[PDB]
Coordinates of C-alpha atoms in Angstrom, one line a residue:
Chain T
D226 CA 111.3 99.0 82.7
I227 CA 114.7 97.5 84.2
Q228 CA 114.5 93.8 85.4
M229 CA 117.1 92.1 87.4
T230 CA 117.8 88.3 87.5
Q231 CA 119.6 87.9 90.1
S232 CA 121.8 84.5 90.7
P233 CA 122.0 82.2 92.5
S234 CA 118.7 82.4 94.2
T235 CA 119.9 80.1 96.9
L236 CA 123.4 79.6 97.8
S237 CA 125.2 77.4 100.6
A238 CA 128.4 77.9 101.4
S239 CA 131.6 77.7 104.1
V240 CA 133.0 80.2 106.2
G241 CA 136.3 81.6 104.1
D242 CA 135.0 80.7 101.4
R243 CA 134.6 83.2 98.3
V244 CA 130.8 83.8 97.0
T245 CA 129.8 85.9 93.9
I246 CA 126.3 87.1 93.5
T247 CA 125.3 88.7 90.0
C248 CA 122.3 90.6 88.9
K249 CA 121.8 90.9 85.2
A250 CA 119.8 93.4 83.8
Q251 CA 117.3 93.1 81.2
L252 CA 115.8 96.3 79.4
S253 CA 112.5 97.2 78.0
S254 CA 111.5 99.9 75.5
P255 CA 109.2 103.0 78.0
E256 CA 106.0 115.7 80.7
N257 CA 107.4 117.4 84.2
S258 CA 107.9 113.4 85.9
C259 CA 111.1 111.6 86.0
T260 CA 108.7 108.4 85.6
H261 CA 108.0 109.3 81.7
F262 CA 111.3 110.9 81.3
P263 CA 113.4 108.8 79.1
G264 CA 110.2 107.6 77.3
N265 CA 109.7 111.3 76.6
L266 CA 113.0 111.7 75.2
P267 CA 112.3 110.8 71.6
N268 CA 109.6 113.8 71.7
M269 CA 111.9 116.2 72.3
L270 CA 114.4 115.0 69.8
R271 CA 111.1 115.7 67.4
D272 CA 110.8 119.2 68.7
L273 CA 114.5 119.9 68.1
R274 CA 114.4 118.2 64.7
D275 CA 111.4 120.0 63.8
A276 CA 112.4 123.4 64.4
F277 CA 116.2 122.9 63.4
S278 CA 114.2 121.4 59.9
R279 CA 112.9 124.9 59.5
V280 CA 116.2 126.8 59.6
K281 CA 118.5 124.4 58.2
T282 CA 118.5 126.2 54.6
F283 CA 119.2 129.7 55.8
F284 CA 122.5 128.2 57.8
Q285 CA 123.8 126.0 55.5
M286 CA 123.5 128.2 52.6
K287 CA 124.7 131.3 55.0
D288 CA 127.8 128.9 55.8
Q289 CA 130.0 128.7 52.4
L290 CA 132.7 126.3 53.9
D291 CA 133.0 122.8 53.6
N292 CA 135.1 121.3 56.5
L293 CA 132.9 119.5 58.8
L294 CA 133.2 121.0 62.6
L295 CA 131.2 118.1 64.7
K296 CA 133.5 115.0 63.6
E297 CA 133.0 111.5 65.1
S298 CA 136.0 112.2 67.0
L299 CA 133.2 114.0 69.3
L300 CA 130.9 111.1 69.1
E301 CA 133.6 108.7 70.1
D302 CA 133.7 111.1 73.2
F303 CA 130.4 111.0 74.0
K304 CA 130.2 107.5 74.0
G305 CA 133.0 107.1 76.4
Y306 CA 134.2 107.4 79.7
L307 CA 134.2 111.2 80.0
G308 CA 130.7 111.6 77.8
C309 CA 128.4 113.4 80.6
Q310 CA 131.5 116.1 80.5
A311 CA 131.7 116.2 76.8
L312 CA 128.0 116.5 76.1
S313 CA 127.4 119.2 78.8
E314 CA 130.2 121.3 77.5
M315 CA 128.6 120.9 74.3
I316 CA 125.5 122.1 75.2
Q317 CA 126.6 124.9 76.8
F318 CA 128.9 125.6 73.9
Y319 CA 125.8 125.8 71.8
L320 CA 123.8 127.8 74.3
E321 CA 126.3 130.3 74.8
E322 CA 128.6 130.8 72.1
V323 CA 126.6 130.0 68.8
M324 CA 122.7 130.2 69.5
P325 CA 122.8 134.0 71.1
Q326 CA 124.5 135.8 67.9
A327 CA 122.5 133.0 65.3
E328 CA 118.9 134.1 66.5
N329 CA 118.5 137.5 65.6
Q330 CA 117.8 138.1 61.9
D331 CA 114.5 137.2 61.1
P332 CA 111.5 137.0 63.4
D333 CA 110.9 133.1 62.2
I334 CA 114.2 132.1 62.5
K335 CA 114.7 133.8 65.7
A336 CA 111.5 131.9 67.3
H337 CA 113.0 128.7 65.5
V338 CA 116.5 129.1 67.2
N339 CA 115.0 130.4 70.6
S340 CA 112.7 126.9 70.7
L341 CA 115.8 125.1 70.2
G342 CA 117.7 126.9 72.8
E343 CA 114.9 126.8 75.3
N344 CA 114.6 122.9 74.8
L345 CA 118.3 122.5 75.3
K346 CA 117.9 124.6 79.0
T347 CA 114.9 122.3 80.0
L348 CA 117.1 119.0 78.7
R349 CA 119.5 120.2 80.8
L350 CA 117.6 120.9 84.0
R351 CA 115.6 117.3 83.2
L352 CA 118.9 115.4 83.1
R353 CA 119.8 117.1 86.4
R354 CA 116.3 116.3 88.5
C355 CA 116.4 112.9 86.9
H356 CA 118.1 109.7 87.9
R357 CA 121.6 111.8 88.5
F358 CA 122.1 112.2 84.7
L359 CA 123.6 115.8 85.4
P360 CA 126.0 116.7 87.1
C361 CA 128.6 114.5 86.0
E362 CA 130.5 112.4 88.1
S363 CA 137.9 115.5 76.0
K364 CA 140.3 116.8 73.1
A365 CA 137.2 116.2 70.7
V366 CA 135.6 119.4 72.6
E367 CA 139.0 121.3 73.1
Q368 CA 139.2 120.9 68.9
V369 CA 135.7 122.1 68.0
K370 CA 135.9 124.9 70.1
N371 CA 139.2 126.1 69.0
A372 CA 138.0 125.4 64.9
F373 CA 135.3 127.6 66.1
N374 CA 137.1 130.2 67.5
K375 CA 139.2 130.4 64.3
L376 CA 136.2 130.7 62.1
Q377 CA 135.2 134.2 63.7
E378 CA 131.6 135.0 62.4
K379 CA 131.3 132.0 59.9
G380 CA 132.0 129.6 63.0
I381 CA 128.3 130.3 64.2
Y382 CA 126.6 129.5 61.0
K383 CA 128.9 126.3 60.6
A384 CA 127.8 125.0 64.3
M385 CA 124.3 126.1 63.6
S386 CA 124.5 124.3 59.9
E387 CA 125.7 121.2 61.9
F388 CA 122.8 121.2 64.4
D389 CA 121.1 118.2 63.0
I390 CA 124.6 116.1 63.7
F391 CA 124.8 117.5 67.2
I392 CA 120.7 116.3 67.7
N393 CA 122.1 113.1 66.7
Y394 CA 124.9 112.7 69.0
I395 CA 122.5 113.8 71.7
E396 CA 120.5 111.0 70.7
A397 CA 123.1 108.3 70.4
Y398 CA 124.2 109.2 74.0
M399 CA 121.0 109.0 75.5
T400 CA 120.5 105.9 73.7
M401 CA 123.5 104.3 75.4
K402 CA 122.7 105.6 78.4
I403 CA 119.1 104.3 78.6
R404 CA 119.8 100.9 77.4
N405 CA 122.3 100.1 80.4
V406 CA 122.1 101.0 84.3
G407 CA 124.2 103.6 85.5
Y408 CA 124.7 102.4 89.1
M409 CA 123.8 98.9 90.7
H410 CA 123.3 98.9 94.5
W411 CA 122.9 95.9 96.8
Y412 CA 120.8 95.1 100.2
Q413 CA 121.4 92.8 103.1
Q414 CA 118.2 91.8 104.8
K415 CA 118.3 89.6 108.2
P416 CA 115.4 87.3 108.9
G417 CA 112.3 89.5 110.0
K418 CA 113.9 92.8 109.9
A419 CA 114.6 95.9 107.5
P420 CA 116.7 95.6 104.4
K421 CA 120.3 97.3 105.2
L422 CA 122.3 99.3 102.5
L423 CA 125.2 97.0 101.8
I424 CA 127.0 98.6 98.8
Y425 CA 125.7 102.0 96.6
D426 CA 126.6 103.1 93.4
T427 CA 127.9 99.7 92.2
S428 CA 131.1 99.3 94.4
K429 CA 131.1 101.6 97.5
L430 CA 130.9 100.1 101.0
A431 CA 127.6 101.7 103.2
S432 CA 128.1 102.3 106.9
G433 CA 129.3 99.2 108.9
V434 CA 129.9 96.9 105.6
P435 CA 133.6 95.0 106.2
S436 CA 136.3 94.9 103.8
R437 CA 134.8 91.3 103.1
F438 CA 132.2 92.6 100.6
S439 CA 132.9 94.3 97.4
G440 CA 130.9 95.3 94.2
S441 CA 131.3 95.1 90.5
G442 CA 130.0 95.7 87.1
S443 CA 128.5 97.8 84.3
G444 CA 126.5 98.1 81.7
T445 CA 124.1 95.4 82.1
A446 CA 125.9 93.0 84.3
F447 CA 126.8 93.7 88.2
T448 CA 128.1 91.4 91.2
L449 CA 128.7 91.2 94.7
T450 CA 131.5 89.2 96.0
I451 CA 132.1 88.0 99.6
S452 CA 135.9 87.2 99.6
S453 CA 135.9 85.6 103.2
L454 CA 132.8 84.5 104.2
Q455 CA 131.8 84.6 107.9
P456 CA 128.6 83.4 110.0
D457 CA 127.0 86.7 110.4
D458 CA 126.9 86.8 106.4
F459 CA 123.7 84.6 106.6
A460 CA 121.3 86.8 105.1
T461 CA 119.0 87.6 102.0
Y462 CA 120.8 89.9 99.2
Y463 CA 118.9 92.2 97.2
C464 CA 120.2 94.2 94.0
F465 CA 118.3 97.4 93.3
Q466 CA 118.1 99.8 91.0
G467 CA 117.3 103.3 91.0
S468 CA 118.0 104.5 87.4
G469 CA 114.8 104.2 85.8
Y470 CA 111.1 104.2 87.4
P471 CA 109.9 102.2 88.2
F472 CA 112.6 101.0 90.9
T473 CA 113.4 97.7 91.0
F474 CA 115.0 95.0 93.1
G475 CA 116.3 91.5 92.1
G476 CA 115.2 88.3 93.0
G477 CA 117.0 88.1 96.1
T478 CA 119.7 85.3 97.2
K479 CA 119.4 83.5 100.3
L480 CA 122.8 82.7 101.8
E481 CA 123.2 79.8 104.2
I482 CA 126.6 79.4 106.4
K483 CA 128.1 75.8 106.3
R484 CA 129.8 74.8 109.7
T485 CA 130.2 71.4 111.1
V486 CA 127.8 68.7 111.7
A487 CA 126.1 69.6 115.3
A488 CA 123.7 67.2 116.8
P489 CA 120.5 68.7 118.1
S490 CA 119.6 68.4 121.8
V491 CA 116.2 67.2 122.2
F492 CA 113.5 68.1 125.1
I493 CA 109.9 67.5 125.4
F494 CA 107.1 69.3 127.0
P495 CA 103.7 67.8 128.1
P496 CA 100.4 69.8 127.7
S497 CA 100.0 72.3 130.6
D498 CA 96.9 71.9 133.0
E499 CA 95.2 75.5 131.9
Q500 CA 95.3 74.1 128.1
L501 CA 93.9 70.7 128.9
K502 CA 90.9 72.7 130.9
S503 CA 90.1 74.2 127.5
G504 CA 89.6 70.9 125.7
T505 CA 93.2 71.0 123.7
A506 CA 96.6 69.0 124.3
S507 CA 99.6 70.2 122.6
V508 CA 102.6 68.4 123.0
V509 CA 106.0 70.2 122.4
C510 CA 109.4 68.7 121.0
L511 CA 112.1 70.7 120.8
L512 CA 115.6 70.2 119.0
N513 CA 118.0 73.0 119.9
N514 CA 121.1 74.0 118.0
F515 CA 121.8 71.6 115.3
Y516 CA 123.2 71.9 111.6
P517 CA 122.7 70.5 109.3
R518 CA 118.8 71.9 109.0
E519 CA 117.4 68.3 107.5
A520 CA 115.8 66.7 110.6
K521 CA 113.3 64.1 111.0
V522 CA 110.9 64.3 114.1
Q523 CA 108.2 61.5 114.7
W524 CA 105.7 61.2 117.1
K525 CA 104.5 57.9 118.7
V526 CA 101.5 57.7 120.9
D527 CA 101.6 54.5 122.6
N528 CA 104.3 52.9 120.0
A529 CA 101.6 54.0 117.1
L530 CA 103.2 56.3 114.4
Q531 CA 101.7 59.5 114.0
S532 CA 100.7 61.7 110.8
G533 CA 98.7 64.8 110.3
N534 CA 98.6 66.1 113.6
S535 CA 101.7 68.2 114.1
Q536 CA 103.4 70.8 112.7
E537 CA 107.2 71.6 112.6
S538 CA 108.6 75.2 113.2
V539 CA 112.2 75.8 112.3
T540 CA 114.5 79.1 113.2
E541 CA 116.6 80.9 111.1
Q542 CA 120.2 79.9 111.0
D543 CA 121.9 81.8 113.8
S544 CA 124.2 84.5 113.0
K545 CA 127.1 83.0 115.7
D546 CA 127.1 79.7 115.5
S547 CA 125.4 78.8 112.4
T548 CA 123.1 76.0 114.0
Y549 CA 119.3 76.2 113.8
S550 CA 116.5 74.9 116.1
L551 CA 112.9 73.4 115.5
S552 CA 109.9 72.6 117.4
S553 CA 107.4 70.0 116.6
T554 CA 104.1 70.1 118.0
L555 CA 101.7 67.7 118.2
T556 CA 98.0 68.6 118.9
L557 CA 95.4 66.5 120.1
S558 CA 91.6 67.0 121.5
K559 CA 91.6 66.3 125.3
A560 CA 89.7 63.3 125.0
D561 CA 91.8 61.8 122.2
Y562 CA 94.7 62.7 124.5
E563 CA 93.5 60.9 127.5
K564 CA 92.6 58.0 125.7
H565 CA 96.5 57.2 125.6
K566 CA 99.6 56.7 127.7
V567 CA 103.0 57.1 126.5
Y568 CA 104.0 60.0 124.3
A569 CA 107.3 60.1 122.3
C570 CA 109.3 62.3 120.1
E571 CA 111.8 60.4 118.0
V572 CA 114.7 62.3 116.0
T573 CA 117.2 61.2 113.7
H574 CA 119.9 63.6 112.6
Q575 CA 123.0 63.2 111.1
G576 CA 125.3 64.2 114.3
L577 CA 123.2 61.4 115.9
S578 CA 124.5 57.9 115.6
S579 CA 121.1 56.5 116.7
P580 CA 117.8 57.9 116.6
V581 CA 116.8 59.7 120.1
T582 CA 113.6 59.2 121.9
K583 CA 112.4 61.7 124.5
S584 CA 108.8 60.3 125.9
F585 CA 106.6 60.7 129.1
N586 CA 103.7 59.1 130.5
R587 CA 100.4 60.9 131.1
Chain V
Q141 CA 121.2 108.7 111.0
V142 CA 117.5 109.4 110.6
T143 CA 114.8 107.3 112.0
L144 CA 111.4 106.5 109.7
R145 CA 108.2 104.6 111.9
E146 CA 105.4 102.9 109.7
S147 CA 101.9 102.7 111.1
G148 CA 98.7 101.3 110.1
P149 CA 96.2 98.7 110.4
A150 CA 97.2 95.3 110.8
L151 CA 93.9 94.0 109.5
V152 CA 92.0 94.9 106.5
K153 CA 89.2 93.5 104.6
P154 CA 89.0 92.8 100.8
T155 CA 88.2 95.8 98.8
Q156 CA 89.0 98.0 101.7
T157 CA 91.6 100.8 101.2
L158 CA 94.9 100.6 103.6
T159 CA 96.2 103.8 104.7
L160 CA 99.8 103.7 105.9
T161 CA 101.3 106.7 107.6
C162 CA 105.1 107.3 107.7
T163 CA 107.1 109.4 110.5
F164 CA 110.5 110.5 110.1
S165 CA 112.7 112.5 112.1
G166 CA 116.2 113.8 111.4
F167 CA 115.7 115.0 108.2
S168 CA 113.0 117.5 106.5
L169 CA 110.8 116.9 103.2
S170 CA 111.1 120.7 103.2
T171 CA 115.0 120.1 102.5
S172 CA 115.5 120.4 98.9
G173 CA 116.6 117.2 97.0
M174 CA 115.0 115.0 99.9
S175 CA 112.7 112.2 99.3
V176 CA 110.5 109.3 100.8
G177 CA 109.5 106.2 99.3
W178 CA 107.3 102.9 100.2
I179 CA 108.4 99.5 99.6
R180 CA 106.8 96.2 100.3
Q181 CA 107.3 92.4 101.0
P182 CA 104.8 89.6 100.7
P183 CA 105.5 86.7 102.9
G184 CA 108.3 84.9 101.3
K185 CA 108.8 86.8 98.3
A186 CA 111.4 89.8 96.5
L187 CA 111.0 93.2 98.0
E188 CA 109.0 95.5 95.3
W189 CA 108.9 99.1 95.3
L190 CA 105.6 100.7 95.5
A191 CA 106.0 104.9 95.5
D192 CA 107.7 107.7 96.3
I193 CA 107.2 111.6 97.0
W194 CA 109.6 114.3 96.7
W195 CA 110.4 117.8 98.3
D196 CA 108.7 119.8 95.0
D197 CA 105.6 117.2 95.4
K198 CA 106.7 115.4 92.3
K199 CA 105.2 111.7 93.0
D200 CA 105.9 108.5 91.4
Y201 CA 104.0 105.2 91.3
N202 CA 104.7 101.1 90.5
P203 CA 102.7 100.9 87.1
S204 CA 102.0 96.8 88.4
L205 CA 99.5 98.3 90.9
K206 CA 98.6 102.2 90.0
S207 CA 95.1 103.4 90.0
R208 CA 95.0 102.1 93.4
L209 CA 97.8 104.3 94.9
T210 CA 98.3 107.8 96.1
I211 CA 101.1 108.9 98.0
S212 CA 101.1 112.6 99.8
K213 CA 103.1 114.4 102.1
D214 CA 102.3 116.7 105.4
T215 CA 106.3 118.8 106.0
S216 CA 104.7 120.3 109.1
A217 CA 103.7 117.1 110.8
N218 CA 107.2 115.5 109.3
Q219 CA 104.6 112.5 107.5
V220 CA 104.1 110.9 104.6
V221 CA 100.5 108.9 103.4
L222 CA 100.4 106.3 101.1
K223 CA 96.7 105.1 100.6
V224 CA 96.1 101.6 98.5
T225 CA 92.9 100.8 97.3
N226 CA 90.6 97.7 96.6
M227 CA 92.9 95.7 98.5
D228 CA 93.4 92.2 98.0
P229 CA 94.7 89.0 99.9
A230 CA 97.7 89.0 97.5
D231 CA 98.5 92.5 99.2
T232 CA 99.3 90.6 102.2
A233 CA 102.9 92.2 103.2
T234 CA 105.3 94.2 105.2
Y235 CA 105.2 97.4 104.0
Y236 CA 108.3 99.6 104.7
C237 CA 109.2 103.6 104.2
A238 CA 112.5 104.8 103.4
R239 CA 114.4 108.0 102.5
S240 CA 116.2 108.8 99.4
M241 CA 117.6 112.1 98.1
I242 CA 118.4 113.6 94.8
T243 CA 122.3 112.8 95.1
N244 CA 121.2 109.1 95.6
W245 CA 118.6 107.7 93.9
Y246 CA 118.6 104.5 96.5
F247 CA 117.3 104.0 100.0
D248 CA 119.6 104.4 102.4
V249 CA 117.6 104.5 105.7
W250 CA 114.2 102.2 106.4
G251 CA 111.8 101.9 109.0
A252 CA 111.4 98.7 110.9
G253 CA 108.1 98.1 108.5
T254 CA 104.9 97.0 109.4
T255 CA 102.9 94.0 108.4
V256 CA 99.4 94.0 106.9
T257 CA 96.8 91.2 106.5
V258 CA 94.1 91.4 103.9
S259 CA 91.3 88.8 105.2
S260 CA 87.6 88.5 105.8
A261 CA 88.6 86.9 109.1
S262 CA 88.1 88.8 112.4
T263 CA 91.2 89.7 114.7
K264 CA 91.5 87.1 117.9
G265 CA 93.7 87.4 120.4
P266 CA 96.3 84.6 121.3
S267 CA 96.1 82.1 124.6
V268 CA 99.6 81.8 126.6
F269 CA 100.2 78.4 128.1
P270 CA 103.3 77.4 130.0
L271 CA 106.0 75.2 128.6
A272 CA 107.2 74.0 132.1
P273 CA 110.7 72.9 132.5
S274 CA 111.4 69.5 134.2
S275 CA 113.5 66.5 133.9
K276 CA 112.7 65.8 130.7
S277 CA 113.7 69.3 129.6
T278 CA 117.4 69.2 130.7
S279 CA 120.8 68.9 129.2
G280 CA 123.7 69.2 131.5
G281 CA 123.8 71.9 133.7
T282 CA 121.1 73.8 131.6
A283 CA 117.4 73.5 131.2
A284 CA 114.7 74.7 128.4
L285 CA 111.2 76.5 129.2
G286 CA 109.0 78.3 127.3
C287 CA 105.3 80.0 126.4
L288 CA 102.9 78.0 123.6
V289 CA 101.4 81.2 122.3
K290 CA 98.3 79.7 120.5
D291 CA 95.3 80.7 118.2
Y292 CA 95.7 84.2 117.3
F293 CA 95.2 86.1 114.1
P294 CA 96.5 88.1 112.0
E295 CA 100.2 88.7 112.6
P296 CA 102.5 90.0 114.4
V297 CA 103.0 89.0 118.0
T298 CA 106.0 89.9 120.2
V299 CA 107.5 88.0 123.2
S300 CA 109.8 89.0 125.9
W301 CA 110.8 87.1 129.2
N302 CA 110.9 88.6 132.9
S303 CA 110.0 91.9 131.1
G304 CA 113.3 91.9 129.0
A305 CA 115.6 90.9 131.4
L306 CA 116.4 87.6 130.1
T307 CA 117.4 88.1 126.3
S308 CA 120.2 85.3 126.2
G309 CA 119.1 81.8 125.3
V310 CA 115.7 82.7 123.9
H311 CA 114.4 81.4 120.5
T312 CA 111.1 82.6 119.4
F313 CA 109.7 80.4 116.7
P314 CA 108.1 81.6 113.4
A315 CA 104.6 81.4 113.7
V316 CA 102.7 78.3 111.7
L317 CA 99.4 78.7 110.1
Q318 CA 97.2 76.3 111.5
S319 CA 94.4 74.7 109.7
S320 CA 92.1 76.6 111.7
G321 CA 93.3 79.7 109.8
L322 CA 94.7 80.9 113.3
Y323 CA 98.3 81.1 113.8
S324 CA 100.6 79.5 116.8
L325 CA 104.1 79.7 117.9
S326 CA 106.3 79.1 120.8
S327 CA 109.0 80.9 122.5
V328 CA 111.8 78.9 124.8
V329 CA 114.7 79.7 126.7
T330 CA 117.4 77.6 128.2
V331 CA 118.4 78.6 131.5
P332 CA 120.8 77.0 134.2
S333 CA 118.9 74.0 135.9
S334 CA 120.3 75.6 139.4
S335 CA 117.9 78.6 138.5
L336 CA 114.7 76.6 138.2
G337 CA 113.6 76.6 142.0
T338 CA 115.0 80.4 142.9
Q339 CA 114.4 82.5 139.6
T340 CA 111.0 83.5 138.3
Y341 CA 110.2 83.0 134.6
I342 CA 107.4 84.9 133.2
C343 CA 106.8 85.4 129.3
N344 CA 105.2 88.7 128.3
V345 CA 103.1 88.4 125.1
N346 CA 101.4 91.1 123.2
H347 CA 99.4 91.1 120.5
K348 CA 98.7 94.7 119.2
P349 CA 95.8 93.4 116.5
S350 CA 93.8 92.8 119.3
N351 CA 94.9 95.0 122.3
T352 CA 95.9 91.9 123.8
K353 CA 98.6 91.7 126.8
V354 CA 99.1 88.3 128.6
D355 CA 102.0 87.6 131.0
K356 CA 102.3 83.6 132.0
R357 CA 104.2 82.4 135.0
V358 CA 106.5 79.0 133.5
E359 CA 106.7 77.2 136.8
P360 CA 108.6 73.8 136.8

């Protein structure tokens, strides 16, 4: 279970500014499904250790040497950048160069070694089926192979005696991989529309995404940077993870674009005759293309300030000029509406030096 | 590139089962490595992954709502079905299907999404009223006019102008939930003042949840 803390939750920046959205990952400890695969990895390590425990003495006694073959240099490779390639090379080494010739003595030993090899093959297939563990995308393995070559017959015995160490290295690699997110992806969503792939594989630009966007990060910290903000970058941005089931998203960042103060144009619409026939009267006040979003719209019916009988609605920020529009609808019963004469909408906004009133007489 | 389209009821009652259908083209769920998944978004909340299915018929579900989810595919018909049992008002959301790939493990193409409301209330079509232009809706060489789409349920509703011939200058406001439990919105458009006595302005409102189609002429 991988969760993503995304910050800031909301953000308001100016054209040309540089904005960084952070997605911090938090992990939680989790047969033929990927959903329970990294939770079932300890069980495969258990199967491997049991089977090898039943042959360890035979091979440690048959190998009468004392030079460690799998040195920690191999583990340094495993947990490094090319660790995937190192691990799969080691798996192939054991499956093709050591195990076919080690399993042919007693039926008991043969059964145990064949179970070890079958688990290695099944692990290879599963890593390949799930979350892009395989295929990948190392002088220690070369040294292992060279020593094994020099050791002729005794080499197989040596590698089989150190299979426990090999198991531990596999365990360390898988533990490092599951305590980290391989890739972070990013989606951009415009209001009322499906998300659009913005960045994938942590740093790659999706289709139609300009150079202004970039991605970065590793392990548990990831970032999405817009170097030069543009009016069309208004949106909600979500980081997304496909490295583990369930797939999860960030909390999201809503991004508004700052611009110069623009005063609204105020219009007023009286109720239609068609609606008045039905027993209701709706008076609509329209504030068109203004910035910032904050505006004060009050209804006055025969100079009486109204309360509780109007609802506002405001558009999402314009992706071109960065402005808003707002409607305020005053709803009355027809009888109530005909008890009065003057209907006024009064607008206070930063772009207006004094409040603007649009009114009409019934 | 590829295209996906969701379809399902706009309204289901509490405890009923939602059946969502994804229809896709440009790819095949017989193609090795291919996958389809479902994601939802409640009003004003984050995206939440629901489920997926792969070409090898393996399925995966979000534990936060499993026991209630069933995904299936019909590759001959290019369709994926999601079933959500025992629906709750907290499941009110927009549901998307999206394509993914064994080389990808992210959703690169999404459908438009479809809106689902869980409520005991019944569907109701809107009333359309003109917001008539006049001297009080003019500003320079411009005049605003519109349509009030009132008292409908559930979401969504769509508004065009002059059968789509008039697109520039249109602001269709997000619906507000009224104390009656019914939705209401307005669609406004600014036009050249000089065109009011010549050009006819008609708003075309469509409420698919109620099989409602209305055309309202907006006269000065």
